[PDB]
């Protein structure tokens, strides 16, 4: 099986400017304190690395492929108080639902 993650926060791609120059999705850039963000992968001294904001709710499910994972995550987001714009990344198998840019 493949395990998929649903995140109720933005994923960030960040590089060194202490202070990191981060983008979220198209690409909006902003500067963050390194304390506010959480690594989703190994941190890179040269290029960018994927990060998370400290405040995040996540859940997971096993599925034949992403199309079935979206069934369950849409259900989870209706049963709980979750809304937003959706996004899927196949490299990490992570869905993201965010209500940003409002």
């Amino acid at each position: 099986m493949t395990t998929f993650k649903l995140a109720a926060c933005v994923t960030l791609e960040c590089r060194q400017v202490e202070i990191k120059n981060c983008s979220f999705n198209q690409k909006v850039y902003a500067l963050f304190y390194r304390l506010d963000i959480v690594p989703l992968e190994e941190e890179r001294k040269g290029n960018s690395s994927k990060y998370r904001l400290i405040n995040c709710q996540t859940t997971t499910t096993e599925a034949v492929d992403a199309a079935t994972a979206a069934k369950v995550f849409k259900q989870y987001a209706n049963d709980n108080g979750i809304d937003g714009e959706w996004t899927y990344d196949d490299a990490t198998k992570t869905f993201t639902v965010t209500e940003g840019l409002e």
């Epitope: 493949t2 395990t3 998929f4 304390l35 690594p39 190994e42 001294k45 997971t60």
Partner: antibody, heavy 129, light 108 residues
């Protein structure tokens, strides 16, 4: 808490193969890739490859991309490394290892990502006639 | 390749520095980790992101970057139970990883 528990030592004939294994507990197995590292006796550490347990994605070093195959089972939370066409040179300690995140040493640092934070106990595989 | 001095030595109480020199590029282009392996045991993390100590690692161990030398270095003070192998590590791109190793010998 976090434990990587490896399989027992083996002996193999030249040309044969091995499928070594490594059970994980104490962390969400699908959050961190599991790596494999070899140590020829009297020689240093040498990274073999890795597997990302949430899918089948695996990666290997230039030396080992030919004979080695690393896999992960997320029903048992066990990672396996298979090595075909064994040779006298392959007599080594084989270690599984995994990265882990920590909240850093200071208030300012934040949540860090630490490579090879936990290691398995190692398995000595001898190749001999 | 990462090249380390296969042997380094130091007396009780003193401070000892172990080199880690990159042949292929700048040590400022990837983070350098360090590990300790006591005889007959699995490795343990001592440093990551050039100079950060993991949970439980004493202040006696410190990591360093000398961009002029293109050499990273691990400096261990208060030499002792510190007798072990010591290895540096750094990545190579999105997916690959490179280890250095140094046998740290405590004498006197």
């Amino acid at each position: 808490e976090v434990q990587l528990v490896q399989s027992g030592a083996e002996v193999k004939k030249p040309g044969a193969s091995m499928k070594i294994s490594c059970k994980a507990s104490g962390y969400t197995f699908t959050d961190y890739s599991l790596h494999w590292v070899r140590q020829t006796p009297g020689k240093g550490l040498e990274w073999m490859g890795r597997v990302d347990p949430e899918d089948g994605e695996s990666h290997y070093a230039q030396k080992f991309q030919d004979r080695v195959t690393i896999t992960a089972d997320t029903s048992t939370d066990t990672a396996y490394m298979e090595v075909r066409s064994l040779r006298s040179e392959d007599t080594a300690m084989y270690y599984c290892a995994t990265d882990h995140r920590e909240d850093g040493p200071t208030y300012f640092s934040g949540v860090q990502w630490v490579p090879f934070r936990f290691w398995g106990q190692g398995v000595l595989v001898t190749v001999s006639s | 390749v990462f090249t380390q001095p296969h042997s380094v030595s130091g007396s009780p109480g003193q401070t000892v520095t172990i080199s880690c020199t990159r042949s292929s590029g700048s040590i400022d282009s990837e983070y350098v980790q360090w590990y300790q392996q006591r005889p007959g045991s699995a490795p343990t993390t001592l440093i990551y992101k050039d100079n950060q100590r993991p949970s439980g690692v004493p202040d006696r161990f410190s990591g360093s970057i000398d961009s002029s030398s293109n050499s990273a270095s691990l400096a261990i003070s208060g030499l002792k139970e510190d007798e072990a192998d010591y290895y540096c590590q750094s990545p190579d791109g999105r997916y690959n990883r490179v280890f250095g190793g140094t046998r740290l010998t405590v004498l006197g």
